[model samples]
Target: MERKISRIHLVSEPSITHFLQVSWEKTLESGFVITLTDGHSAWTGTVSESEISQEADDMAMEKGKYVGELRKALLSGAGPADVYTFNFSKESCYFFFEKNLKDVSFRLGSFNLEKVENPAEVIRELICYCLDTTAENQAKNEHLQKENERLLRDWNDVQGRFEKCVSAKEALETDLYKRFILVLNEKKTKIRSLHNKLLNAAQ
Candidate 1:
Protein backbone atom coordinates (compact mmCIF):
# COMPACT_ATOMS: atom_id res chain seq x y z
CA MET A 1 0.00 0.00 0.00
CA GLU A 2 1.20 3.54 -0.74
CA ARG A 3 1.91 5.15 2.62
CA LYS A 4 0.30 8.47 3.43
CA ILE A 5 2.70 11.45 3.75
CA SER A 6 2.35 14.85 5.42
CA ARG A 7 4.69 17.85 5.19
CA ILE A 8 4.96 21.14 7.05
CA HIS A 9 7.23 24.01 5.97
CA LEU A 10 8.92 26.35 8.42
CA VAL A 11 10.62 29.72 7.93
CA SER A 12 12.27 32.02 10.42
CA GLU A 13 13.81 35.50 10.38
CA PRO A 14 17.37 36.68 10.96
CA SER A 15 16.80 36.49 14.68
CA ILE A 16 19.22 34.76 17.00
CA THR A 17 16.75 31.99 17.84
CA HIS A 18 16.43 30.77 14.27
CA PHE A 19 19.63 28.83 13.89
CA LEU A 20 19.88 28.71 10.08
CA GLN A 21 19.69 32.34 9.00
CA VAL A 22 23.29 32.62 7.85
CA SER A 23 23.18 29.61 5.56
CA TRP A 24 19.75 30.56 4.29
CA GLU A 25 20.92 34.04 3.23
CA LYS A 26 24.04 32.69 1.57
CA THR A 27 22.04 30.22 -0.48
CA LEU A 28 19.39 32.80 -1.40
CA GLU A 29 21.92 35.43 -2.52
CA SER A 30 23.58 32.87 -4.75
CA GLY A 31 20.26 32.29 -6.54
CA PHE A 32 20.37 28.70 -5.48
CA VAL A 33 17.20 26.67 -5.82
CA ILE A 34 16.77 25.11 -2.39
CA THR A 35 14.64 22.02 -2.33
CA LEU A 36 14.26 20.27 1.03
CA THR A 37 13.01 16.72 1.12
CA ASP A 38 12.18 14.32 3.87
CA GLY A 39 13.69 11.43 1.88
CA HIS A 40 10.31 10.40 0.43
CA SER A 41 7.73 11.39 -2.16
CA ALA A 42 6.46 14.91 -1.35
CA TRP A 43 4.85 18.09 -2.79
CA THR A 44 5.65 21.82 -2.75
CA GLY A 45 3.74 25.12 -3.00
CA THR A 46 4.76 28.74 -3.61
CA VAL A 47 4.38 31.33 -0.85
CA SER A 48 3.80 35.07 -1.42
CA GLU A 49 6.58 37.45 -0.45
CA SER A 50 4.24 39.33 1.92
CA GLU A 51 3.36 36.06 3.70
CA ILE A 52 7.03 35.44 4.28
CA SER A 53 7.40 38.79 6.03
CA GLN A 54 4.30 38.20 8.11
CA GLU A 55 5.60 34.80 9.18
CA ALA A 56 8.86 36.38 10.29
CA ASP A 57 6.95 38.91 12.35
CA ASP A 58 4.82 36.19 13.84
CA MET A 59 7.90 34.15 14.68
CA ALA A 60 9.39 37.11 16.55
CA MET A 61 6.23 37.57 18.54
CA GLU A 62 5.98 33.85 19.23
CA LYS A 63 9.59 33.75 20.35
CA GLY A 64 9.04 36.63 22.77
CA LYS A 65 6.00 34.94 24.26
CA TYR A 66 7.82 31.63 24.40
CA VAL A 67 10.72 33.15 26.29
CA GLY A 68 8.35 34.83 28.71
CA GLU A 69 6.46 31.62 29.34
CA LEU A 70 9.72 29.80 29.94
CA ARG A 71 10.91 32.46 32.38
CA LYS A 72 7.63 32.44 34.22
CA ALA A 73 7.64 28.67 34.43
CA LEU A 74 11.15 28.67 35.83
CA LEU A 75 10.50 31.48 38.32
CA SER A 76 7.24 30.04 39.54
CA GLY A 77 8.65 26.52 39.78
CA ALA A 78 5.87 25.38 37.54
CA GLY A 79 5.27 21.67 37.34
CA PRO A 80 5.62 19.66 34.11
CA ALA A 81 2.00 20.54 33.33
CA ASP A 82 2.77 24.23 33.25
CA VAL A 83 6.02 23.93 31.37
CA TYR A 84 6.45 23.01 27.71
CA THR A 85 6.89 19.30 28.30
CA PHE A 86 8.17 18.34 24.85
CA ASN A 87 11.89 17.88 24.40
CA PHE A 88 12.08 21.02 22.26
CA SER A 89 11.31 24.46 23.56
CA LYS A 90 7.48 24.38 23.46
CA GLU A 91 7.43 28.10 22.74
CA SER A 92 7.20 27.66 18.98
CA CYS A 93 3.99 26.84 17.11
CA TYR A 94 4.13 23.38 15.62
CA PHE A 95 1.97 21.04 13.55
CA PHE A 96 1.13 17.60 14.93
CA PHE A 97 -0.01 14.59 12.96
CA GLU A 98 0.57 10.90 12.62
CA LYS A 99 1.97 9.48 9.37
CA ASN A 100 3.45 11.79 6.73
CA LEU A 101 1.12 14.71 6.03
CA LYS A 102 1.97 15.51 2.42
CA ASP A 103 1.63 19.07 1.02
CA VAL A 104 1.65 20.98 4.33
CA SER A 105 4.61 23.36 4.26
CA PHE A 106 6.02 26.50 5.89
CA ARG A 107 8.06 29.45 4.59
CA LEU A 108 10.25 31.45 6.91
CA GLY A 109 11.56 33.93 4.33
CA SER A 110 12.46 34.27 0.68
CA PHE A 111 15.20 31.76 1.18
CA ASN A 112 13.97 28.46 2.66
CA LEU A 113 11.02 26.09 2.69
CA GLU A 114 10.79 22.93 4.77
CA LYS A 115 8.25 20.19 5.26
CA VAL A 116 8.09 18.98 8.86
CA GLU A 117 5.80 17.73 11.56
CA ASN A 118 5.37 19.08 15.08
CA PRO A 119 6.99 15.93 16.38
CA ALA A 120 9.97 16.56 14.12
CA GLU A 121 10.87 19.60 16.15
CA VAL A 122 10.58 17.64 19.33
CA ILE A 123 12.67 14.86 17.84
CA ARG A 124 15.34 17.34 16.83
CA GLU A 125 15.58 18.64 20.36
CA LEU A 126 15.70 15.13 21.73
CA ILE A 127 18.51 14.25 19.32
CA CYS A 128 20.63 17.09 20.62
CA TYR A 129 20.21 15.89 24.19
CA CYS A 130 20.93 12.29 23.25
CA LEU A 131 24.07 13.24 21.38
CA ASP A 132 25.37 15.04 24.43
CA THR A 133 24.73 12.03 26.65
CA THR A 134 26.32 9.65 24.14
CA ALA A 135 29.52 11.67 24.11
CA GLU A 136 29.66 11.67 27.89
CA ASN A 137 29.20 7.92 28.08
CA GLN A 138 31.88 7.31 25.49
CA ALA A 139 34.37 9.32 27.53
CA LYS A 140 33.50 7.38 30.66
CA ASN A 141 33.94 4.05 28.87
CA GLU A 142 37.39 5.02 27.68
CA HIS A 143 38.46 5.89 31.20
CA LEU A 144 37.15 2.61 32.56
CA GLN A 145 38.94 0.60 29.89
CA LYS A 146 42.24 2.21 30.76
CA GLU A 147 41.78 1.50 34.43
CA ASN A 148 40.86 -2.12 33.72
CA GLU A 149 43.99 -2.69 31.72
CA ARG A 150 46.20 -1.30 34.48
CA LEU A 151 44.57 -3.54 37.07
CA LEU A 152 45.07 -6.65 34.95
CA ARG A 153 48.75 -5.91 34.53
CA ASP A 154 49.23 -5.52 38.27
CA TRP A 155 47.45 -8.83 38.95
CA ASN A 156 49.65 -10.74 36.54
CA ASP A 157 52.80 -9.40 38.19
CA VAL A 158 51.61 -10.50 41.61
CA GLN A 159 50.82 -14.00 40.34
CA GLY A 160 54.29 -14.40 38.92
CA ARG A 161 55.88 -13.51 42.24
CA PHE A 162 53.69 -15.99 44.11
CA GLU A 163 54.69 -18.85 41.81
CA LYS A 164 58.37 -18.03 42.27
CA CYS A 165 58.04 -18.13 46.05
CA VAL A 166 56.42 -21.60 45.91
CA SER A 167 59.21 -22.99 43.70
CA ALA A 168 61.93 -21.65 46.01
CA LYS A 169 60.34 -23.29 49.07
CA GLU A 170 60.31 -26.69 47.37
CA ALA A 171 64.00 -26.43 46.46
CA LEU A 172 64.94 -25.51 50.05
CA GLU A 173 63.10 -28.56 51.46
CA THR A 174 64.91 -30.91 49.03
CA ASP A 175 68.32 -29.56 50.00
CA LEU A 176 67.60 -29.96 53.71
CA TYR A 177 66.66 -33.62 53.28
CA LYS A 178 69.88 -34.41 51.39
CA ARG A 179 72.01 -32.79 54.10
CA PHE A 180 70.26 -34.83 56.84
CA ILE A 181 70.99 -38.08 54.98
CA LEU A 182 74.64 -37.24 54.67
CA VAL A 183 74.93 -36.66 58.43
CA LEU A 184 73.25 -40.01 59.18
CA ASN A 185 75.65 -41.90 56.93
CA GLU A 186 78.67 -40.34 58.59
CA LYS A 187 77.54 -41.31 62.09
CA LYS A 188 76.87 -44.92 61.05
CA THR A 189 80.33 -45.27 59.46
CA LYS A 190 82.07 -44.01 62.60
CA ILE A 191 80.18 -46.44 64.86
CA ARG A 192 80.98 -49.42 62.60
CA SER A 193 84.72 -48.62 62.45
CA LEU A 194 84.92 -48.25 66.20
CA HIS A 195 83.15 -51.60 66.77
CA ASN A 196 85.54 -53.49 64.41
CA LYS A 197 88.63 -52.09 66.12
CA LEU A 198 87.27 -52.99 69.56
CA LEU A 199 86.52 -56.54 68.56
CA ASN A 200 90.00 -57.13 67.12
CA ALA A 201 91.52 -55.78 70.28
CA ALA A 202 89.38 -58.04 72.43
CA GLN A 203 90.33 -61.08 70.35
Candidate 2:
Protein backbone atom coordinates (compact mmCIF):
# COMPACT_ATOMS: atom_id res chain seq x y z
CA MET A 1 0.00 0.00 0.00
CA GLU A 2 1.41 3.34 -1.04
CA ARG A 3 -0.18 6.65 -0.04
CA LYS A 4 1.55 9.66 -1.53
CA ILE A 5 2.38 12.22 1.14
CA SER A 6 0.79 15.44 0.08
CA ARG A 7 2.26 18.76 1.19
CA ILE A 8 -0.91 20.16 2.69
CA HIS A 9 -1.91 23.29 0.80
CA LEU A 10 -3.27 26.35 2.59
CA VAL A 11 -5.44 29.10 1.11
CA SER A 12 -4.18 31.75 3.50
CA GLU A 13 -0.52 32.28 4.26
CA PRO A 14 0.55 30.35 7.36
CA SER A 15 0.30 33.05 10.02
CA ILE A 16 0.93 32.68 13.76
CA THR A 17 -2.45 34.19 14.59
CA HIS A 18 -4.32 31.69 12.42
CA PHE A 19 -2.29 28.89 13.95
CA LEU A 20 -3.24 29.79 17.53
CA GLN A 21 -6.94 30.25 16.72
CA VAL A 22 -7.22 26.82 15.14
CA SER A 23 -5.28 25.25 17.97
CA TRP A 24 -7.46 26.77 20.67
CA GLU A 25 -10.76 26.22 18.86
CA LYS A 26 -9.95 22.59 18.10
CA THR A 27 -7.44 21.10 20.51
CA LEU A 28 -6.04 17.71 19.48
CA GLU A 29 -5.43 16.29 22.92
CA SER A 30 -4.18 12.92 21.67
CA GLY A 31 -0.92 14.54 20.59
CA PHE A 32 0.36 18.12 20.24
CA VAL A 33 3.04 20.02 18.31
CA ILE A 34 3.53 23.56 17.01
CA THR A 35 6.36 25.15 15.00
CA LEU A 36 6.34 28.88 14.37
CA THR A 37 8.69 31.28 12.61
CA ASP A 38 9.78 34.50 14.25
CA GLY A 39 11.79 36.93 12.14
CA HIS A 40 13.09 34.25 9.77
CA SER A 41 14.02 31.91 12.61
CA ALA A 42 12.10 28.76 13.43
CA TRP A 43 10.72 28.22 16.91
CA THR A 44 9.22 24.82 17.67
CA GLY A 45 7.56 23.68 20.83
CA THR A 46 5.63 20.88 22.45
CA VAL A 47 2.29 22.57 23.06
CA SER A 48 0.64 23.10 26.45
CA GLU A 49 -3.06 23.70 27.04
CA SER A 50 -2.45 26.62 29.41
CA GLU A 51 0.02 28.55 27.22
CA ILE A 52 -2.02 28.07 24.10
CA SER A 53 -5.08 29.34 25.92
CA GLN A 54 -3.25 32.48 26.99
CA GLU A 55 -1.74 33.12 23.56
CA ALA A 56 -5.11 32.81 21.93
CA ASP A 57 -6.71 35.03 24.57
CA ASP A 58 -4.10 37.76 24.08
CA MET A 59 -4.68 37.90 20.35
CA ALA A 60 -8.40 38.17 20.90
CA MET A 61 -8.05 40.85 23.56
CA GLU A 62 -5.73 43.06 21.56
CA LYS A 63 -7.60 42.86 18.29
CA GLY A 64 -11.31 43.38 19.01
CA LYS A 65 -12.44 40.78 21.46
CA TYR A 66 -11.36 41.31 25.08
CA VAL A 67 -9.97 44.57 26.50
CA GLY A 68 -7.72 45.86 29.30
CA GLU A 69 -4.08 44.94 29.59
CA LEU A 70 -3.40 41.48 28.17
CA ARG A 71 -2.07 38.82 30.48
CA LYS A 72 1.51 39.47 29.44
CA ALA A 73 2.65 37.70 32.60
CA LEU A 74 1.01 34.53 31.38
CA LEU A 75 2.86 34.86 28.07
CA SER A 76 6.09 36.18 29.59
CA GLY A 77 8.43 34.72 26.97
CA ALA A 78 6.21 34.11 23.92
CA GLY A 79 7.55 35.36 20.63
CA PRO A 80 5.67 38.46 19.51
CA ALA A 81 2.63 37.28 17.58
CA ASP A 82 -1.18 37.71 17.59
CA VAL A 83 -3.38 34.61 17.65
CA TYR A 84 -6.21 32.85 19.46
CA THR A 85 -9.74 30.81 23.37
CA PHE A 86 -12.78 29.53 25.17
CA ASN A 87 -13.28 27.22 28.22
CA PHE A 88 -11.92 23.93 29.44
CA SER A 89 -12.08 20.88 31.82
CA LYS A 90 -14.47 18.66 29.81
CA GLU A 91 -15.84 18.31 26.33
CA SER A 92 -15.91 15.60 23.64
CA CYS A 93 -15.19 16.71 20.13
CA TYR A 94 -12.87 15.52 17.31
CA PHE A 95 -11.29 18.67 15.89
CA PHE A 96 -8.33 19.52 13.68
CA PHE A 97 -5.02 17.70 13.58
CA GLU A 98 -2.14 18.65 15.87
CA LYS A 99 0.20 21.37 14.56
CA ASN A 100 3.90 20.90 13.82
CA LEU A 101 6.11 21.85 10.89
CA LYS A 102 8.67 19.36 9.63
CA ASP A 103 9.74 19.09 5.99
CA VAL A 104 9.61 15.31 5.67
CA SER A 105 6.39 14.16 4.04
CA PHE A 106 5.01 10.83 5.16
CA ARG A 107 1.32 10.42 5.72
CA LEU A 108 0.16 9.43 9.19
CA GLY A 109 -3.25 9.25 10.86
CA SER A 110 -4.93 12.57 9.91
CA PHE A 111 -6.17 13.32 13.44
CA ASN A 112 -2.99 14.68 15.02
CA LEU A 113 -0.99 17.89 14.33
CA GLU A 114 1.06 17.87 11.12
CA LYS A 115 4.65 18.72 10.34
CA VAL A 116 5.28 20.08 6.88
CA GLU A 117 7.94 21.94 4.89
CA ASN A 118 6.36 25.37 5.24
CA PRO A 119 4.15 26.94 7.90
CA ALA A 120 1.14 27.58 5.66
CA GLU A 121 0.80 23.87 5.33
CA VAL A 122 0.40 23.79 9.12
CA ILE A 123 -3.12 25.21 9.16
CA ARG A 124 -4.17 23.79 5.78
CA GLU A 125 -3.93 20.16 6.72
CA LEU A 126 -4.75 20.83 10.35
CA ILE A 127 -7.88 22.79 9.48
CA CYS A 128 -8.84 22.25 5.85
CA TYR A 129 -8.84 18.46 5.53
CA CYS A 130 -10.38 16.27 8.23
CA LEU A 131 -12.01 12.86 8.52
CA ASP A 132 -15.19 14.33 10.03
CA THR A 133 -15.92 18.01 9.64
CA THR A 134 -19.41 17.87 11.18
CA ALA A 135 -17.80 19.43 14.19
CA GLU A 136 -16.19 22.12 12.02
CA ASN A 137 -19.11 24.50 11.88
CA GLN A 138 -19.84 24.05 15.55
CA ALA A 139 -16.28 24.76 16.60
CA LYS A 140 -16.07 27.89 14.44
CA ASN A 141 -19.41 29.21 15.65
CA GLU A 142 -18.38 28.83 19.24
CA HIS A 143 -15.11 30.60 18.58
CA LEU A 144 -16.90 33.49 16.95
CA GLN A 145 -19.43 33.65 19.77
CA LYS A 146 -16.66 34.07 22.28
CA GLU A 147 -15.01 36.72 20.13
CA ASN A 148 -18.24 38.70 19.98
CA GLU A 149 -18.66 38.61 23.71
CA ARG A 150 -15.09 39.70 24.25
CA LEU A 151 -15.25 42.70 21.89
CA LEU A 152 -18.64 43.86 23.08
CA ARG A 153 -17.70 43.86 26.72
CA ASP A 154 -14.46 45.67 26.04
CA TRP A 155 -16.12 48.31 23.88
CA ASN A 156 -18.74 49.11 26.49
CA ASP A 157 -16.11 49.68 29.13
CA VAL A 158 -13.78 51.68 26.89
CA GLN A 159 -16.62 53.89 25.69
CA GLY A 160 -17.58 54.78 29.26
CA ARG A 161 -14.02 55.66 30.23
CA PHE A 162 -13.49 57.74 27.11
CA GLU A 163 -16.65 59.76 27.66
CA LYS A 164 -15.88 60.30 31.30
CA CYS A 165 -12.50 61.77 30.52
CA VAL A 166 -13.93 64.01 27.87
CA SER A 167 -16.61 65.36 30.20
CA ALA A 168 -14.16 66.00 33.03
CA LYS A 169 -11.73 67.82 30.75
CA GLU A 170 -14.46 70.17 29.57
CA ALA A 171 -15.65 70.91 33.13
CA LEU A 172 -12.13 71.74 34.28
CA GLU A 173 -11.60 74.26 31.47
CA THR A 174 -14.86 76.10 32.29
CA ASP A 175 -14.00 76.41 35.99
CA LEU A 176 -10.58 77.95 35.20
CA TYR A 177 -12.16 80.59 32.98
CA LYS A 178 -14.68 81.49 35.71
CA ARG A 179 -11.87 82.04 38.21
CA PHE A 180 -9.97 84.28 35.76
CA ILE A 181 -13.05 86.51 35.21
CA LEU A 182 -13.56 86.96 38.98
CA VAL A 183 -9.93 88.11 39.44
CA LEU A 184 -10.27 90.63 36.60
CA ASN A 185 -13.35 92.22 38.24
CA GLU A 186 -11.55 92.52 41.58
CA LYS A 187 -8.51 94.18 39.95
CA LYS A 188 -10.75 96.73 38.15
CA THR A 189 -12.45 97.71 41.46
CA LYS A 190 -9.10 98.25 43.19
CA ILE A 191 -7.83 100.49 40.36
CA ARG A 192 -10.97 102.70 40.56
CA SER A 193 -10.68 103.06 44.39
CA LEU A 194 -7.02 104.08 44.08
CA HIS A 195 -7.87 106.80 41.49
CA ASN A 196 -10.67 108.27 43.70
CA LYS A 197 -8.34 108.50 46.68
CA LEU A 198 -5.71 110.36 44.66
CA LEU A 199 -8.26 112.85 43.19
CA ASN A 200 -9.81 113.65 46.59
CA ALA A 201 -6.35 114.36 48.02
CA ALA A 202 -5.55 116.76 45.15
CA GLN A 203 -8.89 118.65 45.69
Best by lDDT: 1
Quote the RMSD, in angstroms, for model 2: 18.1
Give per-residue CA lDDT, model 1, range 134-180, as digits (tens). 89789999999999999999999999998999899989998999999
Q: Candidate 2: global Cα-lDDT?
A: 0.41
Of candidate 1, the 10-residue stretch with the lowest lDDT total is 14-23
The C-alpha RMSD in Å for every predicted model, in order, reads 16.7, 18.1
List per-prediction Cα lDDT, in the order shown: 0.42, 0.41
Clashes of each: 14, 8
Tens digits of per-residue lDDT for model 2, 19-116: 22222223232224434332232223354545444544644533212111122211221134422121111122112232222643321112223333
**Backbone clash tally (model 1):** 14
Q: Tell me the spans in candidate 2 whose CA falls farther than 4 Å from its real position.
A: 1-132, 201-203
